[PDB]
Design an enzyme around this catalytic site. Sequence first.
Site, short mmCIF file in Angstrom:
data_model
loop_
_atom_site.label_atom_id
_atom_site.label_comp_id
_atom_site.label_asym_id
_atom_site.label_seq_id
_atom_site.Cartn_x
_atom_site.Cartn_y
_atom_site.Cartn_z
N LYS A 88 -43.78 -44.71 -15.33
CA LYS A 88 -44.24 -45.45 -16.41
C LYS A 88 -45.25 -44.99 -17.16
O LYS A 88 -45.52 -45.20 -18.71
CB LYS A 88 -44.63 -46.91 -16.37
CG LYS A 88 -43.49 -47.89 -15.87
CD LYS A 88 -44.47 -49.30 -15.46
CE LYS A 88 -43.33 -50.20 -15.37
NZ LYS A 88 -42.43 -50.05 -14.15
N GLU A 110 -48.47 -56.56 -22.04
CA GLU A 110 -48.32 -57.35 -20.99
C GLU A 110 -47.90 -56.78 -19.66
O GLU A 110 -47.44 -55.74 -19.78
CB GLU A 110 -47.47 -58.36 -21.34
CG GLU A 110 -46.07 -58.35 -21.36
CD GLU A 110 -45.46 -57.53 -22.28
OE1 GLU A 110 -44.55 -56.76 -22.04
OE2 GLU A 110 -45.81 -57.68 -23.49
N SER A 376 -37.60 -42.95 -9.10
CA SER A 376 -38.57 -43.39 -10.20
C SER A 376 -40.08 -43.84 -9.82
O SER A 376 -40.80 -43.58 -10.52
CB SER A 376 -37.93 -44.84 -10.86
OG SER A 376 -37.40 -45.75 -9.77
#
Lengths: 391, 389
Positions: A88, A110, A376
């Site tokens: 991310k 958010e 990931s």
Amino acid sequence: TYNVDENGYYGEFGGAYIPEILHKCVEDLQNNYLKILESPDFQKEYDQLLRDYVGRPSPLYLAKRLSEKYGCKIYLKREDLNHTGAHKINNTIGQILLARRMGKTRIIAETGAGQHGVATATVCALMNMECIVYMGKTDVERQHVNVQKMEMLGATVVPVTSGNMTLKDATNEAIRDWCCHPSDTYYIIGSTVGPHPYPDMVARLQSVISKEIKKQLQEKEGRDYPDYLIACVGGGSNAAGTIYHYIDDERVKIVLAEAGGKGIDSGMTAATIHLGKMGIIHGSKTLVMQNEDGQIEEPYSISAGLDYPGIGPMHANLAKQKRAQVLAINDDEALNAAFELTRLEGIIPALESAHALAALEKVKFKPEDVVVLTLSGRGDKDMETYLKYKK
Amino acid sequence: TYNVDENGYYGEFGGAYIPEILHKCVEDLQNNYLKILESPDFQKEYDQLLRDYVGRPSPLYLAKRLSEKYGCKIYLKREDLNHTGAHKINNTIGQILLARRMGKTRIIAETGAGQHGVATATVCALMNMECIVYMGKTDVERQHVNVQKMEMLGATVVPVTSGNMTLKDATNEAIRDWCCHPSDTYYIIGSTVGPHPYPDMVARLQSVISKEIKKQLQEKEGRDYPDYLIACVGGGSNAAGTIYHYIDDERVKIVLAEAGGKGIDSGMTAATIHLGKMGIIHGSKTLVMQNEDGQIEEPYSISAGLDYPGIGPMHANLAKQKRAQVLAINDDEALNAAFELTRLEGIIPALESAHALAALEKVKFKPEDVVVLTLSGRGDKDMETYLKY
């Protein structure tokens, strides 16, 4: 191409299906994003931070024991080793650099489980920029370490008490906020979701993954492409990056793992590609799990990271056109795969990533097959789940 | 010269102060360790695993907001980004590679707060080798997540109830197991502690840190040495690694940060250099915190990872000779420094590492100073402590 077309669509999916109020700010982002992302100034700063701050390139690790078990060569693309422990951070770094170049000073986002909110607050700390993260109050209550990290990083967390107080309501307040601040505010979207240009933007930011895979395979195998790319999907961002530079090359098979939860026939599932119907979610025309009353449904997964009702338009298109195989991996299969990787390679994966690992059991590999699977994230954040579900 | 001499000593410190049972196993290790460590075969596999499994080199990250704060250039050596979250993985990888080249097939280790036990279990999983970790029962009870991690990794966790049921006792039992297993067992000690050649071996394995710092400073700064190296110490392995390639360069100032706990005069402290007396711990002559009856004390720090009664002999020598400045950093100071790095750079440091960060408040820096500070670990594991403060 299976990348976005000149209109913001992936075949029939995608676009910008937005109220008139968002037209101006989305158009403005559409005008800016490619000019800045292609610019050398941007590329230089992005690369420097990715190297020194994030620790890229993430290694490509030959998992010898996994390879023995499955009868082929399995490389793990180690996004788990990034600063923040997942991919991310590639996206939040990229978008904050974009925001700065657009003259924005106030960064909003958010978050559901809290990971995107942490990744966002992390880069806002780095950059000394005001950060506001919207988070559904039910999410706030039960994600106290992520809330605490965000606050330590100097972000303001806004409990969203509207609607059901879930991710959907937080998304709605974030979008409203962005819309009302055309002067100073930039909205960092967390996945390959949302109105054009966000899906393409996030895929391009994450494409550093496949850029590296090409170089790393060339060095290790003497060819720049694998026989399989395997990734888990929530919104679709680590998968988008993993496949970006290979997306049109059908020599490279793509296997996407989505969250089956308790099973696709159980009523507690997040398998959007398998079960979703066409809908509009956060301004994107894509597949969305809907109930019998047509309402955007409540997904379930053991992994909060994968329990999103929609899917990025890119992957809807890949699945429809059969460019990618999609598997709905159940909770028990993901847990089993996480324990297996831990035992075989000494790597504790994120529960999200564990869905991708479970896919290895489902495909008959050939002995000369080269598989690249994107790990990931790391599994520290999931340890309470692992202790509860172990044995 | 500040590295080990030809006999296993650092000035008067170090050596191998052991009973006869140990003599065999210890001599064997002393004779063989260095030729393996220096061998191309070893170096090639070590480098491959460090690159592809750990993610090395760890970046050298210029912390611009921290740099602006303290009025000089502060680079963080990012051991926090390694697989496992700290530098201990460098040591477990290196030592299991040695164990294998020695034909050993059963792996044992001690752990206190659990981080070495995790790093050991990690590589034994990779390598498919039997792993047994000795851990004081108090520590087993204090560290439920690390115990469960070791079990997930395939290791057997043996609760040790001898002595005070903490790190010194688990170390004692590991040693004792090793000596009972001349055939098949290799003992991966967790720090730059124990009998020669363990101090030097671990320092050599950790020296990849400073090998990298040299190349990274060359690229970033044009010179290959900083004005300061700053690191925290428990047993002293991240620090030894950080300084190893600079240890005889007097242009490079060394600042070691030890755990003051509630303060050196508080009764609740772990500041071995400041408070220890010369003595033997785990077959090493070094400084050791001792009660008045001369027994090994229970240390205290807010950071469980700095719960070391003793310190590596390397560091006792560096301090006595004034080659290193040693600061005793209190709980409060370490906590404030952790919050500071989180806010300024978006990096949540280990509480161990926060003791090195707090040293930034204590040093008088010049504008053209270049500091490298080893961020030994990330602080995910510490969030329950940070929440409380």
